[PDB]
Amino acid sequence: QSVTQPDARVTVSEGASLQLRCKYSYSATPYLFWYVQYPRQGLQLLLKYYSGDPVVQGVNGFEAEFSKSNSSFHLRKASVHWSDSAVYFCAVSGFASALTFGSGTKVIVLPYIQNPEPAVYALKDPRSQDSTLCLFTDFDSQINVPKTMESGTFITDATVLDMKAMDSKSNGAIAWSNQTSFTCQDIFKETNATYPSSDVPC
Amino acid sequence: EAAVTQSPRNKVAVTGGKVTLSCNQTNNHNNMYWYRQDTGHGLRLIHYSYGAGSTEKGDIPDGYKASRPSQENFSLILELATPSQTSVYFCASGGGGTLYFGAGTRLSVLEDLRNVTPPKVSLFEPSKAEIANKQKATLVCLARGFFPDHVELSWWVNGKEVHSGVSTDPQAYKESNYSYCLSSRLRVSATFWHNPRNHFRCQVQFHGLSEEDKWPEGSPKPVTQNISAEAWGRADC
Numbered sequence A: 001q002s003v004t005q006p007d008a009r010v011t012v013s014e015g016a017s018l019q020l021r022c023k024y025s026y027s028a029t030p031y032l033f034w035y036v037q038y039p040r041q042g043l044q045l046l047l048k049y050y051s052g053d054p055v056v057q058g059v060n061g062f063e064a065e066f067s068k069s070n071s072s073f074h075l076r077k078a079s080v081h082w083s084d085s086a087v088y089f090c091a092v093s094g095f096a097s098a099l100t101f102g103s104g105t106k107v108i109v110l111p112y113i114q115n116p117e118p119a120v121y122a123l124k125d126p127r128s129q130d131s132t133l134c135l136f137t138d139f140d141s142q143i144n145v146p147k148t149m150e151s152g153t154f155i156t157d158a159t160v161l162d163m164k165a166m167d168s169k170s171n172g173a174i175a176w177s178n179q180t181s182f183t184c185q186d187i188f189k190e191t192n193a194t195y196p197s198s199d200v201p202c
Numbered sequence B: 001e002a003a004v005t006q007s008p009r010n011k012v013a014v015t016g017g018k019v020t021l022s023c024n025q026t027n028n029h030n031n032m033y034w035y036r037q038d039t040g041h042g043l044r045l046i047h048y049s050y051g052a053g054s055t056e057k058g059d060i061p062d063g064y065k066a067s068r069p070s071q072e073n074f075s076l077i078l079e080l081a082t083p084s085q086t087s088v089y090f091c092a093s094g095g096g097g098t099l100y101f102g103a104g105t106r107l108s109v110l111e112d113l114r115n116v117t118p119p120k121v122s123l124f125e126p127s128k129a130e131i132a133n134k135q136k137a138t139l140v141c142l143a144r145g146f147f148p149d150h151v152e153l154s155w156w157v158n159g160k161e162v163h164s165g166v167s168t169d170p171q172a173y174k175e176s177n178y179s180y181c182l183s184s185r186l187r188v189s190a191t192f193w194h195n196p197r198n199h200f201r202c203q204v205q206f207h208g209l210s211e212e213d214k215w216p217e218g219s220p221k222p223v224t225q226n227i228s229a230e231a232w233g234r235a236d237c
């Protein structure tokens, strides 16, 4: 009949531990679950509890401990990894009671960029004169990506891309403006190493 | 078996329209439910059924009707669609315990259908600087001007869909009140980018009006369609 997740977002570093708090208000002997949602798919069950052993396990050492004592069902993971980034939902049911969900907690796990080379590049759309945008990339997971200020100028949120090599993880954000002449140096003023498209044959 | 299927996956409706979201399961589960996911509310139960032939109201059943015709079918019927009903709907089937979900149905109920607009997709080329120093090439694709945000951006290299090395935005951003934007990166090796036989293509499948649907404006009907921007690898020096 009621579940409460106090934190809507939890940013943790790869390697560090994770705990998601869940509080519930159910008359009965509630059943308890944790579902996870990968970007733009349905929810997949992560772990569940009905009776007996108060500590339930799931895939990857995901633990959830029940406590009528203090009405909680906190999720915990010893060490988190990049692939763990998702939205975790807590839910409560009971005999002849349909699943009730919490508001969810988006877990954002920051990967370790061993050798970071912060650089902002100006790219061009050839099939369109004037069309250019700034690519901020290879920065460190701890740096905060500048927010937008003006109208007609936009900066996306950091995304992490992975190639098929052991390293090949890269942070990136994109910015663009419909202004007459503002460069990548000022829209991303709070950062390092602006390599301008001066171009050289050799 | 293993399946819960929703249809349609995307839908645009006008205030007052009739919308029917369908769900079919190949699980024989006695139970089926319809939820809506909304920022700030997680998933909220609308209606559910304990068995073919019967319907039970969920927590927010106003505005919606449900109908379980048989064991594997459960429909949500918005008789008179209202803007508040634009949401992402999820269907699930369940065997007394854990629930098995669908992929979701994106629904937009508009006061004015003419806000529906397809995107303009642009392909920005790899920085030569980045290429020189890192020996890697990031192609960034940018789609803009699309009102419903019911889209999927994909990358195709030499006709085959590509995943390794791509990172597109998880959520379209609104850049105006009735216009969205979305970007994506495709980072490849400088060697690969420098091969002129390599053909790169950024596709964006837009979900808009159906052929049936009336379009109240003297402009092209913004029907569902694929829109792409492409480029070919360049030699160098």
Ligand SMILES: *[C@@H]1O[C@H](CO[C@@H]2O[C@@H](C)[C@@H](O)[C@@H](O)[C@@H]2O)[C@@H](O[C@@H]2O[C@H](CO)[C@@H](O[C@@H]3O[C@H](CO)[C@@H](O)[C@H](O)[C@@H]3O)[C@H](O)[C@H]2NC(C)=O)[C@H](O)[C@H]1NC(C)=O
Residues within 6 Å of the ligand: A151, A152, A178, A179, B144, B145, B175, B176, B177, B179, B180
């Ligand atoms: C740079 O771009 C901004 C933003 O406009 C938007 O650009 C993209 C992000 C697109 O995705 C679209 O959503 C849109 O084109 C321009 O701002 C816009 O300026 C115009 C002109 O002043 C505004 O139009 C006015 O709208 C009012 C509404 O009451 C009318 O009364 C006026 O008659 C007039 O038509 C428009 O509203 C405004 N958009 C926003 C979101 O504020 C900006 O002008 C442009 N600058 C340059 C130098 O090109």
Ligand SMILES: *[C@@H]1O[C@H](CO[C@@H]2O[C@@H](C)[C@@H](O)[C@@H](O)[C@@H]2O)[C@@H](O[C@@H]2O[C@H](CO)[C@@H](O)[C@H](O)[C@H]2NC(C)=O)[C@H](O)[C@H]1NC(C)=O
Residues within 6 Å of the ligand: A065, A066, A067, A069, A070
């Ligand atoms: C249930 O809560 C107890 C108490 O924790 C604190 O007190 C609450 C009532 C609240 O006001 C908060 O300040 C705290 O949550 C937890 O107590 C711990 O219990 C474990 C064993 O379960 C024990 O090893 C610890 O020493 C206890 N903590 C202290 C300070 O002595 C208890 O863990 C909670 N129950 C479960 C199942 O998690």
Ligand SMILES: *[C@@H]1O[C@H](CO)[C@@H](O[C@@H]2O[C@H](CO)[C@@H](O)[C@H](O)[C@H]2NC(C)=O)[C@H](O)[C@H]1NC(C)=O
Residues within 6 Å of the ligand: B161, B205, B224, B225, B226
């Ligand atoms: C847009 O492009 C996609 C990708 O090419 C098309 O997808 C195919 O769709 C049919 C029917 O839905 C399937 O049988 C194929 O297997 C799909 N191919 C892939 C690679 O997914 C889609 O049909 C196109 N849509 C429009 C409206 O043109």
Ligand SMILES: *[C@@H]1O[C@H](CO)[C@@H](O)[C@H](O)[C@H]1NC(C)=O
Residues within 6 Å of the ligand: A190, A191, A192
């Ligand atoms: C990069 O700039 C940031 C922001 O000012 C600064 O904190 C940092 O010291 C710079 N990089 C390094 C490696 O010091």
